[PDB]
């Protein structure tokens, strides 16, 4: 079926531009479970060019793998490859021979951003201004401006899937989830998904419509989980509530510690109608004039 061809594919396609030799690659402590398997902290000697050992991190599949999951592996393999972007993580290579698939990715110092959140407090632990909060949804904005101009959904954007790099530089990761919509620009599942109710757009939820639209809906729940420095959206409600919730144009109140713009940017990505959501390039802009509007 779909999954055995790009098992085939994978296994046949050399690839010497990715492919990393098992024996080079030395694996460590598990820093995590994503969704589709394990990520464990790893090195790796003589990584494309660079002379030594370099840390990184591994993504492999966890125990009992369902076609599901390596389906997910293969698709985080294939779209990697195609990005480069300051904002995205870094894809550097994939053991595929003599073991298990791996994949080689670029290791964050400080994990992700929801738990980077909640090791943190404002000031007016780690310290965070609004500033420093601004300053991270802008730099996922422009990450996904370019995904969203490469023709890509990303589907899972949320603060566990965005990983903060030394410098506190945002990087989106995984990939697991996201499709290419070059010919419709719309991408749709007959079956349900994956991806958290709570993160989701009312039309992906009912409909099973993704577009570069439910993507920035989902990075309205992100900037929530920013401004509420990694809170858990729509607290105390379950997730089954929310098909009647958001039908009835129920949204998450103004959280404490949060400007009448960065709300009413919230809302607007919250948009019932998927065309008056704001586009990421609007999404930077906006930011970037509270960023210099509070100096």
Known sequence: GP????????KILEDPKWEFPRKNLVLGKTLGEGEFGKVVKATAFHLKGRAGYTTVAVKMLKENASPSELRDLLSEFNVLKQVNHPHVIKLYGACS????????????????????????????????????????????SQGMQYLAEMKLVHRDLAARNILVAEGRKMKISDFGLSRDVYEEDSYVKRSQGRIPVKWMAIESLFDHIYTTQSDVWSFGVLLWEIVTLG??????????????????GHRMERPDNCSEE??????????????????????????????????
């Open 3 to 10: 999954l055995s061809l790009s098992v085939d594919a994978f």
């Open 97 to 140: 021979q003599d073991g298990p698939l791996l994949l080689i990715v670029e290791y964050a110092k400080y994990a992700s951003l929801r738990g980077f959140l909640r090791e943190s407090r404002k000031v007016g632990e780690r310290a965070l201004t609004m500033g420093d909060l601004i300053s991270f949804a802008w730099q996922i």
């Open 231 to 248: 809170g858990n959206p729509y607290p105390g409600i379950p997730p089954e509530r929310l098909f009647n919730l958001l039908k009835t």
């Open 262 to 295: 960065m709300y009413r940017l919230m809302l607007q990505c919250w948009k019932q109608e998927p065309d008056k959501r704001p586009v990421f390039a609007d999404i930077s802009k906006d930011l970037e004039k509270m960023m210099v509007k509070r100096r």
